[PDB]
Amino acid sequence: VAAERLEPRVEEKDGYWILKEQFRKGINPQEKVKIEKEPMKLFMENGIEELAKIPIEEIDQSKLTKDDIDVRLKWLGLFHRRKNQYGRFMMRLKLPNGVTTSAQTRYLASVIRKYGKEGCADITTRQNWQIRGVVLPDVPEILKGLAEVGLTSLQSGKDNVRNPVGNPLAGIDPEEIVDTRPYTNLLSQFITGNSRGNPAVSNLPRKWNPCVVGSHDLYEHPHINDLAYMPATKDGRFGFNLLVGGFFSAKRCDEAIPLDAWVPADDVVPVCRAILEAFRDLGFRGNRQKCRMMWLIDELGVEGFRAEVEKRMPQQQLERASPEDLVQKQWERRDYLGVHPQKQEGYSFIGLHIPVGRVQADDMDELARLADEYGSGEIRLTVEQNIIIPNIETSKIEALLKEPVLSTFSPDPPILMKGLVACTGNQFCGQAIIETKARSLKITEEVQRQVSLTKPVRMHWTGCPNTCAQVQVADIGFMGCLTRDKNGKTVEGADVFLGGRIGSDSHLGEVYKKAVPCDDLVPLVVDLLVNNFGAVPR
């Protein structure tokens, strides 16, 4: 690689970071959008206040404003549902480590409640909240209300650092390696500039996923993150080995690889900044399918990329990885659903199944009430789109198990439901080829009616090749497609994936059978479970 390739391609101008004029040739249309107007100005210069006053019909009449609502607003966590819910916006938070409070939960419920049939909420595969139904004129007031309850929505979509994922059992697990909350909190604060906005990291060539590992279970899926912090001692000090470049896309899926770098715990933020600066400065900004960080790592090689991170460190040093990390390879991933003792004697947590991650305002209020009455007002989200309520005195569990809402959000659903993960799908998402959430529940119910099993089989349903519900990690994965019935009629279908493994012995699954009509999946899945996962016909 020529030394010229290493010239930073962006420059700080008037508080924002912009592509230098010599590096603007051949860019994709998303880069053109960012050049035409800095997305962070919608928040940091209160551009949203004026935008929110313009009728959508008018907004749509010029490129600048249309790009504001369709692209730039994703820097404020607002996602126009142009195709499937025109003029309404999904809103996505920063929720490091999946931790929420009852007050935050009631606040979000109050927002969606206003929108009636256009409103609901969802837990995401990055243990995050999304709310739905938002109209533009309400945005200024929602931004205020979020701030008031201690939340931010900043930089949660498009070319930004996505939700910092941690251990759902952080601080409460007798077997934890290190509490991930301080680190995921610190990263989120760094990314969002303490909720004011951080333009130093908001003009990336592409999205970028971080996680901090604290569990032997690897609940955090470090193998599929752009940056994963693996806890490891080095020379008697606590810190993290660094894995880089994990990603999924329609074109390519790749597991994270070692940077061959270790940092002390206190250097979590400095090294996040260094990697992000390297990516921002040097990343390719052409074909959007070749813009994720791994593509830069392949072009420079890992050592060339590592050198780029090193020079952006303070003291310009980056220690080599420690030979062993703290994660035990001998580990059976633990079920967190149900009632489990905390490390704090006299206390339990409860994992509740949230069917396909979907909740209404009334459900949110009920979960908030349980957290206040039984817990400490805390609710934790998981990447399987479930919840954990921690800090329940164990003597209250008997009363808790009789709560009527636990029949809907169960601490002990059937085993196939425990592992079921499903993306938004075509109810709201404009990229979706099929309906996912309702369909996956129905198929799973019908499959479980036919077979009993003891293995915790994990089934993931995703509505298009963007694979937001990560079908490549599943025991059985279903990727939406259109296909044909026996009469050649168009029907919704799934490509069926097998071979995904999670935890330390991770592996990416691959298509096993293409184009299965969704109405034919039950018998296929019944047979797969009997033949490959030890299921027994009822």
Which of 234, 212, 233, 208 minimizes the C-alpha distance to 221?
A: 212
The dihedral sign for the CA sequence 214, 216, 218, 219? negative
The dihedral sign for the CA sequence 429, 433, 435, 437? negative
Total of chain residues touching K ion, rule CB under 5 A: 3
Q: Which does 464 bind (CB under 5 to 8 A by kind): ligand SF4, ligand SRM, Cl ion, none?
A: ligand SF4
| Residue linked to tokens 């009822």 | 538
When asked if residue 386 is in the footprint of K ion (CB under 5 A), the reply is: yes
Q: Which stretch binds ligand SRM (CB under 6 A): 31-39, 123-131, 274-282, 328-336?
A: 123-131
When asked if residue 428 is in the footprint of ligand SRM (CB under 6 A), the reply is: yes
437 assigned to a ligand binding site: no
Which tokens go with 464?
A: 């298009």
When asked if residue 124 is in the footprint of ligand SF4 (CB under 6 A), the reply is: no
Other CB atoms closer than 10 Å to residue 379's CB: what's the count? Answer: 25
Q: Which long-range contacts (CB under 8 A, 24 or more apart) does 53-57 make?
A: 53/137, 54/136, 56/86, 56/87, 56/136
Q: How far apart are CA 137 and CA 149, in angstroms?
A: 20
SS3 321: coil
| Residue linked to tokens 């820097």 | 75
Q: Which stretch binds ligand SF4 (CB under 6 A): 189-197, 258-266, 396-404, 422-430?
A: 422-430
Q: How far apart are CA 337 and CA 443, in angstroms?
A: 21
Among 130, 184, 188, 410, the residue binding ligand SRM under the rule CB under 6 A is 130
Which of 430, 433, 434 minimizes the C-alpha distance to 443?
A: 434
First to last CA, the chain: 61
Q: Which stretch binds K ion (CB under 5 A): 108-116, 130-138, 261-269, 378-386?
A: 378-386
Strand spans (E) along 314-443: 338-341, 347-352, 358-359, 378-381, 387-393, 421-422
Q: Which is nearer to ligand SF4, 97 or 467 (CB)?
A: 467
The contacts of residue 425 (CB under 8 Å, 6+ apart) are 432, 434, 435, 436, 437, 439, 461, 463, 480
120 assigned to a ligand binding site: no
Among 195, 450, 466, 504, the residue binding ligand SRM under the rule CB under 6 A is 466
Q: Which is nearer to K ion, 271 or 502 (CB)?
A: 502
Q: Which stretch binds ligand SRM (CB under 6 A): 155-163, 179-187, 329-337, 445-453?
A: 155-163
Q: Which does 386 bind (CB under 5 to 8 A by kind): ligand SRM, ligand SF4, K ion, none?
A: K ion
Which tokens go with 512?
A: 């096993």
Q: Which is nearer to K ion, 41 or 460 (CB)?
A: 460
Among 9, 88, 126, 418, the residue binding ligand SRM under the rule CB under 6 A is 126
Beta bridge partners of 381: 387
When asked if residue 185 is in the footprint of ligand SF4 (CB under 6 A), the reply is: no
185 assigned to a ligand binding site: no
Among 9, 41, 92, 460, the residue binding ligand SRM under the rule CB under 6 A is 92
When asked if residue 139 is in the footprint of ligand SRM (CB under 6 A), the reply is: no
Among 30, 431, 450, 452, the residue binding ligand SF4 under the rule CB under 6 A is 431
Q: Which is nearer to ligand SF4, 327 or 468 (CB)?
A: 468
Among 168, 197, 246, 463, the residue binding ligand SF4 under the rule CB under 6 A is 463
Among 253, 429, 502, 524, the residue binding ligand SF4 under the rule CB under 6 A is 429
Q: Which is nearer to ligand SRM, 207 or 306 (CB)?
A: 207
Q: How far apart are CA 18 and CA 322, in angstroms?
A: 37
Strand spans (E) along 434-502: 451-452, 459-462, 476-484, 490-498
Q: Which is nearer to K ion, 354 or 434 (CB)?
A: 354
Distances 468 to 249, 422, 449, 473, 511 between C-alpha atoms, Å: 9, 9, 28, 11, 16
- Residues engaged in binding Cl ion (CB under 5 A): 82-83, 157-158, 430
Instruction: Extract the annotated binding site for [4Fe-4S] cluster.
Output: 423, 429, 464, 468
Interacting residue ranges for ligand SF4, rule: CB under 6 A: 423-425, 429, 431-432, 462-464, 466-468
Instruction: Extract the annotated binding site.
Output: 81, 124-126, 128, 130, 132, 206-207, 209, 248, 289, 292, 385, 423-424, 429, 464, 468, 470
